[PDB]
Amino acid sequence: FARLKRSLLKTKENLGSGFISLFRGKKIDDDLFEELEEQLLIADVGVETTRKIITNLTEGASRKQLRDAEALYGLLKEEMGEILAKVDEPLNVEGKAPFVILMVGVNGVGKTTTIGKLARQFEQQGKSVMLAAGDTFRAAAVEQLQVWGQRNNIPVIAQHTGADSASVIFDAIQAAKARNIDVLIADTAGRLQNKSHLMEELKKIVRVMKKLDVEAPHEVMLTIDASTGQNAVSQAKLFHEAVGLTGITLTKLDGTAKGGVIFSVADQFGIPIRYIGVGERIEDLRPFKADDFIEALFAR
């Protein structure tokens, strides 16, 4: 995974292959674990997840009675591989009419653009897609979706600026079912300034969907930006506590040294990481595969 390896360069400065130069010729002691702990934190692995990692490393190293630091690399590969393995369930949007994905997250992390990429990917697999411009007060985000949808021959349900979000989405599910759409992707508001207001809106949207399908939304997908580091974790915590997240898309891993936040997100929530954005192309919004990611992160 060449493209994946290249996109992770900044994170690899401290993690994965980044561990190699740190362990080189070192002996295993408190100083070393201290330095390792520092590289993990710098990469935004997070205090709690770093502690779990160091603790399990400490133990595994003692069980095998290791003396030379170079060997800690493989133990870390296994330990960190384990953390991501627990959230490796791929998103399966098949067999529904439609399969409803409610895209949540704050403004400015590229939700609308992620919606476009996901819509193209599903069409490239043979599925029909419909979009719902549920971020009703942001005329620019609604217009972005409408214009792009028009030219890609993808129906977009939208109403006047300030329309009730739950109503636009209700109408979109209604239109999706009438037209035999396979996947419906709904955008949502993202002003985290007034958290209670935003969360109540999402709760309403979710309640209203039940009038049409007891199973909708089939996926509540949070989009977070890896370059915002631990802010991504704070955002995940907020949305998850309010509404139930069933999937996470982590974008902008390319170029940030904070790629370690993926471990923090995986470990603290246990919510499947569905996609990781590692470039600007449609295919760069990669369905997440824990093994490919770990191999790319740890490869020299």
Query: Is the Cβ–Cβ distance between 207 and 189 less than 8 Å?
Result: no
Query: Is the Cβ–Cβ distance between 229 and 261 less than 8 Å?
Result: yes
Domain span at 187: 90-300
| Residues across the chain | 300
Q: Which residues are annotated as a binding site for GTP?
A: 105-112, 187-191, 251-254
Same domain, 13 and 131: no
The domain boundary, picked from 64, 89, 114, lies at 89
Same domain, 124 and 258: yes
Count CB atoms within 10 A of the CB of residue 76: 22
Which CATH number characterizes residue 29's domain? 1.20.120.140
Same domain, 109 and 18: no
Same domain, 64 and 164: no
Q: At what angle do helices 72-85 and 47-63 cross, to 10 degrees?
A: 130
Query: Is the Cβ–Cβ distance between 288 and 88 less than 8 Å?
Result: yes
Same domain, 52 and 170: no
The approach used to solve this structure was X-ray
Q: Which position has the token pair 């160091």?
A: 54
Same domain, 61 and 138: no
Same domain, 163 and 236: yes
Same domain, 81 and 215: no
Same domain, 2 and 83: yes
* C-alpha radius of gyration, the chain, whole number: 21
- Position 292: which residue type? D
Question: What resolution does the deposited structure have, in angstroms?
Answer: 1.9
Query: Is the Cβ–Cβ distance between 133 and 158 less than 8 Å?
Result: yes
The domain boundary, picked from 39, 71, 89, lies at 89
**Nearest Cα to 136, choosing from 156, 113, 158?**
158
* Domain count across the chain: 2
Query: Is the Cβ–Cβ distance between 154 and 144 less than 8 Å?
Result: no
Same domain, 166 and 255: yes
φ and ψ at residue 298, rounded to 5 degrees: -90, -15
Query: Is the Cβ–Cβ distance between 130 and 98 less than 8 Å?
Result: yes
Cβ neighbors of 294 (< 8 A, separation 6 or more) are: 16, 77, 80, 81, 84
Which CATH number characterizes residue 264's domain? 3.40.50.300
Same domain, 96 and 33: no
The domain boundary, picked from 73, 89, 105, lies at 89
Q: Which residues are annotated as a binding site?
A: 105-112, 187-191, 251-254
Concatenated DSSP letters of 270-284: ---EEEEE-SSSGGG
Same domain, 104 and 253: yes
Please name every residue paired with 103 in a beta bridge, in sequence order, or none if there are none: 221
